[PDB]
């Protein structure tokens, strides 16, 4: 029993983190086989931030301008190239700790573990969701760029996020490991801001199932709703539409608890319209939307 924000064990990723320094800028890199990946903004200077031409900036670099350190060991850079918004630094040593891995772009609403790193040294690990607006509500300080997000399946690390920036509201934005930004954000100085966000309905339902499995039943009722009627309420409260595929995805949790998905939707409707009346669900006085159905199945009986 119990239900926590639970990250994947980070050891396989820890062995891949390195420090990358160019000029006076230091950030983190990801060392897999004989390549180190890092944000291309490592080559920026504050004196050219409006519209940096990264192709020009990189042409003016040499391998020796990049200082790469794995712990106390310096890795010799033997090639450099740009892929979208990431830099690929070829090094003369393959990382002996390279896990089995994939580069996999995630969908808004999915979750992943973040290994926050500073100076190539891992500092902490926590669970995040990709918001509908393509930001993440992370916890990152100066020097955190190049930290990565990932999921682990069996022995295989699926890298999905590399950290690039903190937006004015304190939320975070980054790229997949092919260097393509999540959402409409750019690695140049602008007034860019997080767009309007919504609540991840399928995840809230998953979390209500987690609560039932953990003995919280006070929000249950005898009523059911239709998908159409529920989605009218979802719209009013800035929740994402619920699809039949979401309903299907929630099947296993519905079967384990014996509560039909549309039955649980009727509970969610009442919670949106009435609040909780001073009660809590899984230790929260709000509706939590950062656990996917998969996350719930992973922790629940
Ligand atoms: O978001 C930034 N600056 C605003 C922007 C300027 C242009 C685009 S965004 C980050 C902030 N930053 C951190 O180390 C840091 C990270 C964090 O999460 N929290 C935190 O307090 N600090 C230094 C690098 N810096 C940056 C510099 C150049 C570029 Cl091009 C980019 Cl993308 C990022």
Curated annotation (Swiss-Prot):
Reaction(s) catalysed by this chain's protein = TSAVLQ-|-SGFRK-NH2 and SGVTFQ-|-GKFKK the two peptides corresponding to the two self-cleavage sites of the SARS 3C-like proteinase are the two most reactive peptide substrates. The enzyme exhibits a strong preference for substrates containing Gln at P1 position and Leu at P2 position
Q: Where is this cross-link: Glycyl lysine isopeptide (Lys-Gly) (interchain with G-Cter in ubiquitin)?
A: 5, 90
Give residue spans on the Cytoplasmic membrane side: 1-301
Residues forming the catalytic site:
41, 145
Taxonomy, superkingdom: Viruses
Modulation of this protein's activity: Inhibited by pyridone-containing alpha-ketoamides compounds 13a and 13b. In turn, alpha-ketoamide 13b (tert-butyl (1-((S)-1-(((S)-4-(benzylamino)-3,4-dioxo-1-((S)-2-oxopyrrolidin-3-yl)butan-2-yl)amino)-3-cyclopropyl-1-oxopropan-2-yl)-2-oxo-1,2-dihydropyridin-3-yl)carbamate) inhibits SARS-CoV-2 replication in human lung cells. Inhibited ex vivo by michael acceptor inhibitor N3. Inhibited ex vivo by compound 11a and 11b.
Give the range the annotation lists for the signal sequence: none
Record's subcellular location: Host cytoplasm; Host Golgi apparatus; Host nucleus
Q: List, for all copies, the residue spans of the domain called Peptidase C30.
A: 1-301
- What's the impact of mutating residue 49 to A? Does not affect ability to cleave and inactivate human TRMT1
Biological function: Cleaves the C-terminus of replicase polyprotein at 11 sites. Recognizes substrates containing the core sequence [ILMVF]-Q-|-[SGACN]. Cleaves and inactivates human TRMT1, preventing tRNA guanine(26)-dimethylation of tRNAs. May cleave human NLRP1 in lung epithelial cells, thereby activating the NLRP1 inflammasome pathway. May cleave human GSDMD, triggering alternative GSDME-mediated epithelial cell death upon activation of the NLRP1 inflammasome, which may enhance the release interleukins 1B, 6, 16 and 18. Also able to bind an ADP-ribose-1''-phosphate (ADRP).
What binding partners and quaternary form does the record give? 3CL-PRO exists as monomer and homodimer. Only the homodimer shows catalytic activity. Interacts with host FBXO22; this interaction promotes the proteasomal degradation of nsp5.
The name on file for this protein is 3C-like proteinase nsp5
Gene behind this protein: rep
Which part of the full protein is shown?
3264 to 3564 of 7096
